[PDB]
Amino acid sequence: KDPWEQTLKANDLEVKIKSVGNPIKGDNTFVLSPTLKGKALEKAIVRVQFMMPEMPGMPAMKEMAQVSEKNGLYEAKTNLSMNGTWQVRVDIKSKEGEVYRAKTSLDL
């Protein structure tokens, strides 16, 4: 019942990600909290993709999350239609144009 939570670091940017509920197949929502020196990164462009191959050697199924800003937090909505391990790529551009990248994974 505990949600999925992961802390990432991309250069000096900290990004905590927290799912809404314990993720099961279907619609899922993840809240991202990017901070620099403890201050929320506002007006950033935040992109989140989920990737899983059905078998090794196949091109991965790839889900692009729909991301919206909630006042320095970012809500990423996606549909994960099968169980397994999903790779997660987080791509963030600050308002001024600085690019940050991090990756993790989610077991569903």
Secondary structure (H, E, C), the chain: CCCCEEEEEECCEEEEEEECCCCCCEEEEEEEEEEECCEECCCCEEEEEEEECCCCCCCCEEEECEEEEECCEEEEEEEECCCCEEEEEEEEECCCCCEEEEEEEEEC
Q: Which two tokens stand for residue 29?
A: 């929502």
Phi, psi of 39 (to 5 degrees): -100, 135
> Domain map of the chain by residue range?
5-107
In sequence order, the 6+-apart residues with CB closer than 8 A to the CB of 51 are 60, 61, 62, 63, 86, 87, 88, 89
**How far is it, in rounded angstroms, from Cα 38 to Cα 23?**
27
Phi-psi category of residue 43: left, alpha or beta, with phi > 0 → left and psi -120 to 50 → alpha: left
The sign of the torsion formed by the CA atoms of 5, 103, 62, 78 equals: positive
**How far is it, in rounded angstroms, from Cα 2 to Cα 98?**
34
CA 66 to chain centre: 10
Roughly how many angstroms between the first and final C-alpha of the chain, as a whole number? 13
Q: Which two tokens stand for residue 102?
A: 């991090």
Neighbour count for residue 44 (Cβ, 10 Å):
20
Residue that has been written with the tokens 């994974």 in this structure: 105
**How far is it, in rounded angstroms, from Cα 73 to Cα 83?**
27
- Look at residues 57, 50, 56, 104 and name the one whose alpha carbon lies nearest to residue 81: 50
CATH number attached to the domain at 5-107: 2.60.40.1930
